[PDB]
UniProtKB/Swiss-Prot annotation, chain B:
Attaches the virion to the cell membrane by interacting with host receptor, initiating the infection. The major receptor is host ACE2. When S2/S2' has been cleaved, binding to the receptor triggers direct fusion at the cell membrane. When S2/S2' has not been cleaved, binding to the receptor results in internalization of the virus by endocytosis using host TFRC and GRM2 and leading to fusion of the virion membrane with the host endosomal membrane. Alternatively, may use NRP1/NRP2 and integrin as entry receptors. It comes from Severe acute respiratory syndrome coronavirus 2 (2019-nCoV). Binds to host ACE2. RBD also interacts with the N-linked glycan on 'Asn-90' of ACE2. Cleavage of S generates a polybasic C-terminal sequence on S1 that binds to host Neuropilin-1 (NRP1) and Neuropilin-2 (NRP2) receptors. Interacts with host integrin alpha-5/beta-1 (ITGA5:ITGB1) and with ACE2 in complex with integrin alpha-5/beta-1 (ITGA5:ITGB1). May interact via cytoplasmic c-terminus with M protein. May interact (via N-terminus) with host bilirubin and biliverdin, thereby preventing antibody binding to the SARS-CoV-2 spike NTD via an allosteric mechanism. Glycans are attached at N47. It comes from the Viruses. This is Spike protein S1.
Length: 28, 50
């Protein structure tokens, strides 16, 4: 149900942390 | 210019930097390159005048 339109995502945060990320999870 | 808070500088089509953020103040500066142009000499013939 994601609404149509246009948006531009802005950088806020930068992490030098070098984590190898081959997977991810959502915290509800 | 309406710089967004993340922008350290702005640039023209030539990749030349048009504007910058200052590292010691939260201000955004336009940069205009220095006035220049051809020096053209209008002369009669050296037979007739210097
Ligand atoms: C990240 O982990 C995967 C294993 O799941 C491995 O194959 C991959 O080479 C690792 N990448 C880096 C940059 O360490
Ligand atoms: C530069 O120095 C001024 C005066 O102490 C200070 O207010 C400003 O936050 C400093 N800028 C940076 C980027 O540290
Ligand atoms: C310059 O040209 C004129 C002809 O118009 C001539 O009479 C004169 O002697 C010339 N002067 C020099 C320095 O060549």
């Amino acid at each position: 149900d994601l609404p149509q339109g246009f948006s531009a995502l802005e950088p806020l945060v930068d992490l030098p942390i070098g984590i190898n990320i081959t997977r991810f999870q959502t915290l509800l | 210019k309406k710089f967004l808070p993340f922008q350290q500088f702005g640039r023209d089509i030539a990749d030349t930097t048009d504007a910058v953020r200052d590292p010691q103040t939260l201000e955004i500066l336009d940069i205009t390159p220095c006035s220049f142009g051809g020096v053209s000499v209008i002369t009669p013939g050296t037979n007739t005048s210097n």
